[PDB]
């Protein structure tokens, strides 16, 4: 006890494990049919339906968060253990340009050890593309014992995280007043989690990572390097590397900060040795954002008078206190939104999922162009995998944001609470929002894709002067070209005199090549880039249309005026009014999952082809860059046929010709993804009554053999058939692209 906020019941009982459905009143009835089995896992985590008190739900959520953190620590422990026992980390530490990262060996079972490929140095394993080796090199790891220590620490943290979740629910659980302290939570997360976290990491970088990386770039062998604590212990060794450590922590308090300008650099480019960002520049970044986040954490009034109250700031943002052109939001403004966000967990989850997915996408777009780890940009499989993975995670998270914005509407939205505020006023003109989104999606679909169809027709006619090419009708992205020119002019010896190099070489500047291969070089933006960015705008907008339509019409529409009474996840409202199939908000999350797939797949395809034809390659002794596919994005990626021939047919040479090699698992998974995609269409195109009527004949054949079962076999429900089809489509269609990307990048480098 220290804050007098716990005393939680729910005694740790064991008997409550042999009674599935104990959470739901109808789930603990007695199965009867098979739909109960699927209903068990359809709302197992939905703690909002189970009970009605916000405080009990908040306690459950807090302990579930702790258990999730435990799961993530188990995963981290496993990754560090794989890097410490089944890896060539030491070999890669010796030569990180000729050795392929590998952290997984296959047992010698049926045909199975062929997947163990030669990774350089006599190591027979699987080439990992997770970027773990490049991350551990940048953090400061040199030997595998340190990785083993980190694995043990993560396992201990996992055990500690599953004790904190049991102690904050079964022993001393917080009150609801503690969860509603958003001021204190924001202060602590902004200053103590982000601020102190990045400050501690800056301390690590300044005393462990910067030493080790400086010696590594100098040329020292990995086990000839001192361990990190000697860098911490004696200041003579550390002052050999940096001459600003001879004055200790004195120039900082006497505000002579340019003394420290040799390990807090502000270069802003790429290390020529490694290929990653300047490590001193990274440490300076973390110091600056620690000072920024800690200072940001003193903003909200907590127990001492000074600060803001978010409720006051929300309630004052309203007409006539707004900017005159922003005054259309009326005299209520954001008045009832502090009580929306402190009483609805779904509203918070919707905002946090949207921001988390957007930030994961930002992470994907900032780590190919500013490679932040040593020898990262030259391992093209890792760059591809990291960009692609974070784009998929971001897209899924963003779809879940709309999912929970719709769950908030059907369940947690109260019309009496929020009257004539921004939330009420959005629901009160949503036909305008949706119709204008329909028109912009149409405009973007004609002016991106139908231009590709124009190009196909003009190229098949034999009139390429009529095409939307760089040699036909040019469509230069002059605004992005101008931004690229401003970015390369800014960094001159201007508007950013402190930096030497450009923030990325993607904007302009020079060419960084490491080990012969290109780390980074300018990404020229022509007509093909205009066309593919408008493809991206179009697909993002139709995803927004599909998802926002379900959020805005989750309560009711002109068709079904009482859709909130039907639920958030219901199949339909019968074949009447023409047929109201897929009117729920859940069905809009269903249809937006497909559109997020179609949007993120084209983003990862644009990245793969453009980086493979206009950045990645092999620099010779002179300096001439021979790109991987040979600069064919500017003329083949402007037709659909060139996308099917010069990208899909041509670059799938390495995944279908992989049988009998060490990449044969990728060919197997390529075919497996095609199977699972096609198998999904059985659930997506067919309906429930066919399958229930065919199960009738199968039940008859079973009754005749007297093999009748008590649990009555029923077809999958309508929304469950939709969920199964969507999950299968996404799984197969993404496993296919994963196998295609990874087989391609593990064969041609």
């Amino acid at each position: 006890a220290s804050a007098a906020t716990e005393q939680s019941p729910i005694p740790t009982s064991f008997e409550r494990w042999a009674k599935p459905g104990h959470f739901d009143r109808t789930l603990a009835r007695g199965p009867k049919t098979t739909t109960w089995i699927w209903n068990l896992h359809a709302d197992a985590h939905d703690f909002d339906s189970h009970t009605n008190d916000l405080q009990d739900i908040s306690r459950k959520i807090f302990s579930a968060h702790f258990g999730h953190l435990a799961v993530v620590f188990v995963w981290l422990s496993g990754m560090y253990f794989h890097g410490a026992r089944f890896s060539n980390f030491s070999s890669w530490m010796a030569d990180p340009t000729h050795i392929r990262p590998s952290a997984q060996v296959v047992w010698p079972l049926v045909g199975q050890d062929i997947l163990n490929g030669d990774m350089g140095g006599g190591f027979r394993g699987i080439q990992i593309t997770s970027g773990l080796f490049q991350m551990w090199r940048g953090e400061g790891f040199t030997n595998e014992f340190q990785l083993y220590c980190t694995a043990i620490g993560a396992l201990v943290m996992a055990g500690l995280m599953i004790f904190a979740g049991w102690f904050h629910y079964h022993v001393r659980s917080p009150k609801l007043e503690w969860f509603q302290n958003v001021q204190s939570m924001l202060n602590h997360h902004l200053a103590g989690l982000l601020g102190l976290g990045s400050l501690g990491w800056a301390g690590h970088l300044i005393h462990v990572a910067l030493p080790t990386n400086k010696l590594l770039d100098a040329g020292v062998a990995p086990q000839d390097i001192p361990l990190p604590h000697e860098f911490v212990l004696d200041k003579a060794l550390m002052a050999e590397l940096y001459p600003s450590f001879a004055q200790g922590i004195r120039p900082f308090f006497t505000l002579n900060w340019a003394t420290y300008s040799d390990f807090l650099t502000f270069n802003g480019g790429l290390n020529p040795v490694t290929g990653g960002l300047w490590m001193t520049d990274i440490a300076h970044h973390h110091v600056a954002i620690a000072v920024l986040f800690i200072f940001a954490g003193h903003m909200y009034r907590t127990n001492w008078g000074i600060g803001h109250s978010i409720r006051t700031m929300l309630e004052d943002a309203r007409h006539p206190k707004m900017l005159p052109f922003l005054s259309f939001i009326g005299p209520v403004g954001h008045r009832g939104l502090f009580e929306v966000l402190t009483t609805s967990w779904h509203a918070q989850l919707s905002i946090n999922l949207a921001m988390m997915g957007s930030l994961s996408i930002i992470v994907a777009q900032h780590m190919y162009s500013m490679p932040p780890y040593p020898y990262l940009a030259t391992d093209y499989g890792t760059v591809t995998s990291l960009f692609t993975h974070h784009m998929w995670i971001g897209g899924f998270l963003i779809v879940g944001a709309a999912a929970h914005a719709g769950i908030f509407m059907v369940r947690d939205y109260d019309p009496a609470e929020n009257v004539n505020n921004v939330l009420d006023r959005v629901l009160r003109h949503r036909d305008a929002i949706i119709s204008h989104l329909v028109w912009v999606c149409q405009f973007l679909g004609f002016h991106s894709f139908a231009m590709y169809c124009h190009n196909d027709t003009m190229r098949a006619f034999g009139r390429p002067q009529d095409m939307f090419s760089d040699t036909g009708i040019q469509l230069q992205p002059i605004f992005a070209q101008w931004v690229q020119h401003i970015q390369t002019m800014a960094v001159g010896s201007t508007t950013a005199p402190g930096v030497a190099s450009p923030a990325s070489y993607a904007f302009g500047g020079g060419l960084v090549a490491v080990g012969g291969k290109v780390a980074m070089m300018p990404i020229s933006l022509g007509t093909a880039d205009f066309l593919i960015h408008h493809i991206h705008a179009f697909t993002i907008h139709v995803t927004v249309l599909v998802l926002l339509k379900g959020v805005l019409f989750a309560r009711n529409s002109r068709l079904i005026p009482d859709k909130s009474e039907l639920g958030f996840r219901f199949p339909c409202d019968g074949p009447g009014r023409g047929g109201t199939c897929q009117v729920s908000a859940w069905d809009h999350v269903f249809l937006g999952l497909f559109w997020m797939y179609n949007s993120i797949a084209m983003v990862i395809f644009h990245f793969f082809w453009k980086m493979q034809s206009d950045v990645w390659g092999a620099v010779d002794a002179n300096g001439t860059v021979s790109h991987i596919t040979g600069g064919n994005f500017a003329q083949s990626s402007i037709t659909i046929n060139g996308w099917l021939r010069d990208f899909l047919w041509a670059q799938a040479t390495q995944v279908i010709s992989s049988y009998g090699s060490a990449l044969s698992a990728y060919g197997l998974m390529f075919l497996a993804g095609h199977f699972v995609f096609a198998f999904s269409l059985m659930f997506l195109f067919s309906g429930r009554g066919y399958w229930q009527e065919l199960i009738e004949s199968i039940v008859w054949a079973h009754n005749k053999l007297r093999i009748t079962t008590a649990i009555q076999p029923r077809a999958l429900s309508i929304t469950q058939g939709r969920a199964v089809g969507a999950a299968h489509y996404l799984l197969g269609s993404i496993v296919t692209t994963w196998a295609f990307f990874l087989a391609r990048m593990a064969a041609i480098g």
Partner: protein
């Protein structure tokens, strides 16, 4: 001709369109004991006045969704709502409650209007009513 104050509402895009004035409009009237916020079936939140309220909607289903909200989401319940159909010439017709009770109760005097003394599995099978015009439930016998 219809009595009641329009509920306090800022307007929406979900309201009446052309078909309201060229085909038909519906009106729902109800008495509330206090001025309080309800949910419009067209989207948004409106405030019913104390006393008599009158609201025009585009569909009968919207008027019945509002009425179901009145008699279930409010304590005390508002069960005295009346729904009228308004025609383009101005003609108003009291439709709900059709009798004057409430369809869910049983009134002496309503009369059968869909009853078929059968048992579903004994409609005349379609081979016999082919070129007749009748379809299998709009008939009179039982096979």
């Amino acid at each position: 001709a219809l009595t009641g104050s329009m509920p306090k509402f800022g307007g929406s895009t979900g309201g009446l369109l052309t078909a309201a004035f060229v085909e038909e409009r519906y009106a729902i009237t109800w008495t509330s004991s206090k001025e309080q916020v309800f949910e419009m079936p067209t989207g948004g939140a409106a405030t019913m006045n104390e006393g008599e309220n009158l609201l025009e909607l585009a569909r009968k289903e919207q008027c019945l969704a509002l009425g179901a909200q009145l008699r279930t989401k409010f304590k005390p319940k508002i069960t005295d709502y009346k729904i009228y159909r308004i025609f383009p010439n101005g003609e108003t017709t009291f439709i709900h409650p059709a009798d004057g009770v409430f369809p869910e109760k049983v009134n002496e005097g309503r009369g059968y209007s869909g009853k078929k003394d059968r048992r579903i599995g004994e409609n005349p099978n379609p081979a016999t009513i082919k070129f007749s015009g009748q379809n299998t439930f709009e008939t009179d016998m039982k096979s």
